[PDB]
Design a protein around this motif. Structure first.
Motif, short mmCIF file in Angstrom:
data_model
loop_
_atom_site.label_atom_id
_atom_site.label_comp_id
_atom_site.label_asym_id
_atom_site.label_seq_id
_atom_site.Cartn_x
_atom_site.Cartn_y
_atom_site.Cartn_z
N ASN A 62 25.83 -7.71 1.49
CA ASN A 62 25.24 -8.79 0.65
C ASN A 62 24.18 -8.16 -0.26
O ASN A 62 23.27 -7.50 0.26
CB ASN A 62 24.61 -9.90 1.49
CG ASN A 62 25.54 -10.54 2.49
OD1 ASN A 62 25.24 -10.60 3.68
ND2 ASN A 62 26.68 -11.02 2.01
N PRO A 84 25.42 -16.39 -5.04
CA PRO A 84 25.47 -15.09 -5.71
C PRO A 84 26.27 -15.10 -7.01
O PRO A 84 27.36 -15.63 -7.07
CB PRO A 84 26.16 -14.17 -4.68
CG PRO A 84 25.82 -14.79 -3.35
CD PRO A 84 25.81 -16.28 -3.62
N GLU A 86 28.33 -13.56 -10.43
CA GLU A 86 29.43 -12.59 -10.68
C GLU A 86 28.89 -11.15 -10.63
O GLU A 86 29.45 -10.32 -9.88
CB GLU A 86 30.10 -12.85 -12.03
CG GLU A 86 30.78 -14.20 -12.11
CD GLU A 86 31.44 -14.43 -13.45
OE1 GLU A 86 30.75 -14.31 -14.48
OE2 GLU A 86 32.65 -14.70 -13.47
N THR A 89 27.87 -10.00 -7.07
CA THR A 89 29.08 -9.74 -6.25
C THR A 89 29.62 -8.36 -6.60
O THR A 89 29.97 -7.61 -5.67
CB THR A 89 30.14 -10.82 -6.46
OG1 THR A 89 29.55 -12.09 -6.18
CG2 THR A 89 31.36 -10.63 -5.59
N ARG A 93 30.23 -4.84 -4.26
CA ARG A 93 31.49 -4.07 -4.13
C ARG A 93 31.19 -2.58 -4.35
O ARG A 93 31.74 -1.76 -3.61
CB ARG A 93 32.54 -4.59 -5.12
CG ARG A 93 33.14 -5.93 -4.73
CD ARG A 93 34.26 -5.72 -3.74
NE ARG A 93 35.33 -4.96 -4.36
CZ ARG A 93 36.42 -4.54 -3.74
NH1 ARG A 93 36.59 -4.79 -2.45
NH2 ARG A 93 37.34 -3.86 -4.40
N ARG A 398 36.28 -12.01 -4.34
CA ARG A 398 35.59 -10.82 -4.91
C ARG A 398 36.60 -9.91 -5.63
O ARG A 398 36.23 -9.37 -6.69
CB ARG A 398 34.88 -10.04 -3.80
CG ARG A 398 34.00 -10.90 -2.91
CD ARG A 398 33.70 -10.26 -1.57
NE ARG A 398 32.85 -9.08 -1.68
CZ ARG A 398 31.57 -9.04 -1.32
NH1 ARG A 398 30.99 -10.11 -0.80
NH2 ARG A 398 30.88 -7.92 -1.46
#
Lengths: 695, 695, 79, 79
Positions: A62, A84, A86, A89, A93, A398
RNA sequence: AAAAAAAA
């Protein structure tokens, strides 16, 4: 009472500090990492016990950006940080991809790593400090973890590599790459580039991997004294007997099924071998369990595919290592959309559409490094029918945001500058079938949809998804890898680019010992395939068309004097409202004179073009002005002269210092020769009337 | 490589193109259906295996409107993307209702239908095209399905029925009836009407049923060359003995129990018999399943009540075919809200409320067809305590939106036009008990709440739900069917209307062989039963009355010179904030020359009128003001004088000449006497520092 | 047919009216409570059989402010 | 921070230039919302102290001189 | 001159 432990090291030109033991003492480990006034607080909490029957490692990352880190109250009606973004996120990743493969095989205990941005220096980006933070937190915890990772963003100013570039320098950079690695090898690479040659990109990766050695040494130094003892976890013992028992029954038969060559007959043959072998010994002592059997059978499948590919020429689909699935390409497939194309790689289909818009519809995305307004929008839809399953559509996961970002990086390097193309453009790529790598089928389709809408794109762009298998010293690079051969790739990478030079490289590595020449031949093979895909697309649409014409918004540009535009915005700016209601058309606020006219047809645009030149008659040089007398009173005669400001005559007179009289030459509405060469009083250029006399 | 199957026929004026095989090849079927540049892509994906827990059929239909259709960038600020809404959910229900009866009994395998709008011609509605699309997709797959279903929207203009009316034709029409039907019979009808007699509405259903014949014939011709082989599916075999054993010990001891009039007493008797039969099963239960025995028990119950109702007079509650439940109607039950009514029809109870607002508070619907503003809002709230159960409350389900829409069709026919009622009106209905047909209790409640708040509705309206039970040669029509009696009904329909004329009508049919000759008597019985509810409703409120005494907003429309109103707007709306807030009432900013002074009493209206007069007025003669320097202009100034606006002294202007050079007033604290002087066209009004009286 | 039962008492200079039996008869109990033209409708529904395996006490309270109570249509985009 | 200073009630005119043209340039150059004030209590709204002090320095520089229509030892800087 | 309420 409480003592912090602090280590300070120099990365590039920015002093970086790791602070530990000071906060969140009940979490498994926690570190505040600060780099030149940007600070992120990163904590990991790992479960002590394996949740029973778990067969996939559940790792949660997170990343969250508290707005108090910039010193600003949130714009939302609630004034509170929402779900959250874009952008957040995507950063999560970036942290997850280099971490997930680095935990030992068979580790399945729950782990959660949370990164909070707590203060931001607008010049220093928070992501490259968050990656060091997660690396510090995991290496400080007792969790079984195969050594720390660094992270480094490398730029390309004036043909020189510049580590960790500050936000202003990225304006004139031609490359933005994020390397993450351990001391032994690179683990991942992500980038956007203004069409660099292949060896310049590989040079940047080999550069960034050396500058990270400072972080690796510094985290190893901190863990020497401030780290927890490594809690002992041993991988569950493999059953050699069970693996041998199931192998004799199915290994030869599974190998025979792969030797059979078809899309689906091999599938059916494997199924009859699986069903029988699972059935045999299933009731023998009840030792067999569905989890115990299924895993070994899939493991034997993966072993026969790896061993077959490294030596036997045929792949699962039967094409050689250098061959790409058959192309079929079609343009203008949708009616009444600004531009549309269908790109099929044969089992990957991307129906992709480009819609144009007036500047008003551009997004205004507010974030910690400042508010900015972007005019290119990319959206990627992965509907559940595309892989033949049934599920809730709802909102994108995601991976949809990940793929949507990568495709956007691929195309952004070839989009036109806003000065020669003023319209905002949105590209929506709707995946309709997905058995290859659908993000790279999106880039090809997007270049067709854009140039079909008749945006002046700089060149065609295309993508290729690739894999490498290196069980031994022998290795084979595989081009256009199927989705069904993910497990076969020991590295896999994506190489979106143009006829000459690469736009966006992404690369995730799962195995040790990939030296630079093994990257070099792998993306040299990628250059080969990309050129073949580009060749087929040039035959469908060679160059951009003139305009969409399907109710496409039309925009027109003209330069007008700053004084005339100020009066068109006169009466407090009310004068501009008189135009916009009459012509249904917005006029834009370049007060220095670059008038933009924007309308939904080729008539209201032309009406506005006629209206701007018609309605303003202000010229200070001027010429003899056959304007019409409205009042010939003292304190200067009043004369109708047109748009801008109507000048009043010079003081107490008509001309020549009041040589004549108001009674002389007296009527209303008469044409008279005015000229405007005077002083600028009441905020008006004054005038005079040259009637057989002159001042 | 790829080529589509293409089939184009002509439906009415437009040309329909069915196109297959080109897209989404891994879904069980996919069809692109296009009608005069409006195109929707529709796909069905159906799991072959069945989940061994299901005892109902899970069919999921999603309809979604991509805003890239018709070329516009999404309005939503966050990510320029959209989520499912009311407008889409209602179109999903219109596709769902006809498909569910057609699927064979016992088909429990999961099925998902996804229909995406990809282009819209704003003259042609996407809804009618989608229902043909889903019919094509289902009939083209092998999913067991009983025949393709065509659709047809039927308009009515100058007493002629018109098929598929364009938006331009529809606005003038007096009905908008949707009908969907297989070759044997109609299967669904949904419509709003401008108070038409029952024989006009029935004429529309038969006419639309016959034009759809072209669509059904054409879809078969496509399935004859492009269709999948139907997948084998057999209804699970039913054991006659298992049914017989439960039947032997139930039907006799239930036939007497259904005779018992008391609802609670009968409920206790049947539950006791059920448990006794479960006890009788003893060893091995019923195939070792309590549920299997329960299914047989429910079936025996359904058969006894059905057979009883069509052979015998008494219903589950002892009522006849034509007896509407006891009516208890009570107006004005809530204090301090603009209008309220409680309508109780037997157990179904609805608390309904009407609120008025200024035209400003109307909603702006960004539909794909085009943006529109509606002034009438209906909201339907179904809390779980109305059923006697516990559950969540927060988000509305599909049925709440369905019922809200049907209730809105009931009252929308009788609302006054905005050009003699200048308010937006919101009706909220709270269903406080729901045994029976709640949605048609909500129409009555809304028609009492509206004419109680004092809106001049054209007539009182009311509604009823009805059921048809039909066998091999005979049928009984039941009025006011209860929730328990819906299972026996083969057809059910809802009618809402005034003393004369249907306003909304809805029908769902579950069996073939119903006809115009049956519907003729069924709607005549509805005209009977509705005409009784109207009389009881009439006694409580005979006619619409005066407006609400105090709480209701009243509107005043004072006329001001609009250039002064534009200046009162200030820097695009910054001073008016204070003016609306200090009055505490919704005074409007409209710059059309009609200022909306909306307030909840005459005092705040007069306070607001005096407040706009203070700032807009300028004293026409006044006194010899000792004006003090307030501002700098370009060779100009602003002087405080009588009224809301300052005057300008140009430097030369004390006698139309510089008799005394006027430099000394050009500073603050001089405050020299001035007098009122003329208003000029430029807006820089004339002022002079002269003691002598100026007019 | 149907009629409420009503008790009115004076609490701190505001008359309070307890009204029952008229609405939500299906729910276990309902009581329109009004204090000088502010009015709230309160209803409780309890399950008659305890779900086996429950250990804690599942009590749920929901308070709702419908804006029609103040005479104003909603400020939200969706109204 | 919101900053406010007194500047002389005539030379305040020179801060503004001809209309809004120099106000646009000063607000664009400093990143401050400096408003027009005849009183001379010039208000310089800012988002931080650096932008405030930058705006104070330029408003100090570009109106620093008293015009009394008098004699100046003025050096020619550009012909 | 920097001009009219719309919480997706």
């Amino acid at each position: 009472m409480l003592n912090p432990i602090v280590r300070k090291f120099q990365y590039g030109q920015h002093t970086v500090t790791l602070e530990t033991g000071m906060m969140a003492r009940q979490a498994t480990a926690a570190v505040m990492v600060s780099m030149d006034d940007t600070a992120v607080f990163v904590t990991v909490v790992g479960q002590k016990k394996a949740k029973p029957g778990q067969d996939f490692f559940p790792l949660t990352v997170n990343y969250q950006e508290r707005t108090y880190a910039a010193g600003r109250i949130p714009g939302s009606f609630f004034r509170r940080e929402g779900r959250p973004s874009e952008g957040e996120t995507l950063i999560a990743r970036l942290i997850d991809r280099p971490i997930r493969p680095l935990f030992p095989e068979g580790f399945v205990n729950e782990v959660q790593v949370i990164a909070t941005v707590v203060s931001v220096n607008p010049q220093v980006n928070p992501d490259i400090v968050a990656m060091i933070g997660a690396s510090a937190a995991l290496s400080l915890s007792g969790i079984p973890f195969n050594g720390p990772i660094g992270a480094a963003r490398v730029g390309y100013i004036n043909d020189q590599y510049v580590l960790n570039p500050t936000q202003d320098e990225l304006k004139e950079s031609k490359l933005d790459l994020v390397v993450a690695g351990t001391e032994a090898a690179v683990l991942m690479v992500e980038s956007e580039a203004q069409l660099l040659s292949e060896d310049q990109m590989l040079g940047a990766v080999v550069f960034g991997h050396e500058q990270q050695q400072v972080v690796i040494q510094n985290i190893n130094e901190l863990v020497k004294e401030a780290g927890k003892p490594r809690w002992d976890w041993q991988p569950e013992p493999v059953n050699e007997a069970l693996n041998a028992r199931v192998a004799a029954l199915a290994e030869a038969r599974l190998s025979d099924a792969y030797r059979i060559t078809d899309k689906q007959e091999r599938y059916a043959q494997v199924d009859v071998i699986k069903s029988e072998t699972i059935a045999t010994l299933l009731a023998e002592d009840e030792t067999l369990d569905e989890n115990e059997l299924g895993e070994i059978l899939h493991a034997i499948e993966k072993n026969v595919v790896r061993s077959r590919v490294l030596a036997g020429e045929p792949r699962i689909d039967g094409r050689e290592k250098d061959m790409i699935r058959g192309l079929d390409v079609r343009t203008g497939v949708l009616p009444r959309t600004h531009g549309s194309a269908l790109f099929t790689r044969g089992e990957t289909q991307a129906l992709v559409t480009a819609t144009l818009g007036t500047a008003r519809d551009a997004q205004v995305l507010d974030e910690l490094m400042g508010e900015r307004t972007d005019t290119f929008l990319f959206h990627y839809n992965f509907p559940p029918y595309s892989v033949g399953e049934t599920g809730m559509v709802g909102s994108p996961k995601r991976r949809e945001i990940g793929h949507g970002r990568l495709a956007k990086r691929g195309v952004l390097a070839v989009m036109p500058d806003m000065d020669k193309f003023p319209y905002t453009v949105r590209v929506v790529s709707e995946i309709t079938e997905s058995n290859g790598s659908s993000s790279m089928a999106s880039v090809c389709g997007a270049s067709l949809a854009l140039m079909d809408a008749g945006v002046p794109i700089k060149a065609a762009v295309a993508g290729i998804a690739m894999g490498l298998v290196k069980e031994g010293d022998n290795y084979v690079v595989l081009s256009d890898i199927l989705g069904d051969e993910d497990h076969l790739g020991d590295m896999d990478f994506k190489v979106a680019g143009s006829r000459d030079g690469i736009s966006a490289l992404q690369m995730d590595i799962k195995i040790e010992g990939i030296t630079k020449e093994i990257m070099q031949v792998a993306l040299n093979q990628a250059k080969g395939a990309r050129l073949h895909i580009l060749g087929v697309m040039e035959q469908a649409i060679n160059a951009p068309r003139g305009d969409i014409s399907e109710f496409a918004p039309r925009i027109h540009t003209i330069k007008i004097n700053p004084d005339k535009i100020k009066d068109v915005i006169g009466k407090g700016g009310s004068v501009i409202r008189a135009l916009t209601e009459e012509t249904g058309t917005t006029i834009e606020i370049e007060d220095d004179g670059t008038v933009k006219i924007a309308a939904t047809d080729g008539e209201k645009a032309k009406h506005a073009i006629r209206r701007i030149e018609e309605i303003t008659a202000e010229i200070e040089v001027g010429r003899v002005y056959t304007g019409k007398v409205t009042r010939i009173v003292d304190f200067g005669a009043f004369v109708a002269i047109g748009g801008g400001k109507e000048g009043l005559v010079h003081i107490s007179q008509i001309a020549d210092k009041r040589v004549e009289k108001v009674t002389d030459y007296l009527q209303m509405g008469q044409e008279v020769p005015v000229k405007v060469l005077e002083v600028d009083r009441q905020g008006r250029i004054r005038l005079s009337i040259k009637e057989a006399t002159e001042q």
